[PDB]
Nucleic acid binder design. Structure first.
Length: 53
DNA sequence: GTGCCTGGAGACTAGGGAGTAATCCCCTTGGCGGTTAAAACGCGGGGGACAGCGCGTACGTGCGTTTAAGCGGTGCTAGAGCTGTCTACGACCAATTGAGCGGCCTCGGCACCGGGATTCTCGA
């Protein structure tokens, strides 16, 4: 399974990893940080979508 | 529904951060006395918060009128991408030097301390 769906989530991981890789935010990057961004933004999106419903 | 272009996924090899030994070690947290300037209790008050009245006016509301102004068309016009093509163009590791920090020593106005001249009391 790809990294965008290995954790069973909704938001893509490769998209935010490509955004930080060329956005020049650090020298290196840990493996847990893009999926952590994935989890935080998908939880914020799900909460505001439940409130929108 | 249907679909082709392309970022996404991923293992192997150099190559630079992580937290666990290690040890100073400086800052801090905790308490004892004192003494003192600030915090607290109270008491009369008077000056400022607050209710009410006079009023008048100017906006709440309504009506004739203009007044741009909105919806729809379409050419005129001139500003936004994208692929070639070439030039600059800022970084990589290394010898040499440098210039601002670690810790040291010198001035200098401010506050405290003593004499010269002046004024006050008594004595001669």
């Amino acid at each position: 399974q790809s990294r965008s769906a290995k954790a069973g989530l909704t938001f893509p991981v490769g998209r935010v990893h490509r955004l930080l890789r060329r956005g020049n935010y650090a020298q290196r990057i840990g493996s847990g940080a893009p999926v952590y961004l994935t989890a935080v933004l998908e939880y914020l999106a799900a909460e505001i979508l439940e409130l929108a419903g």
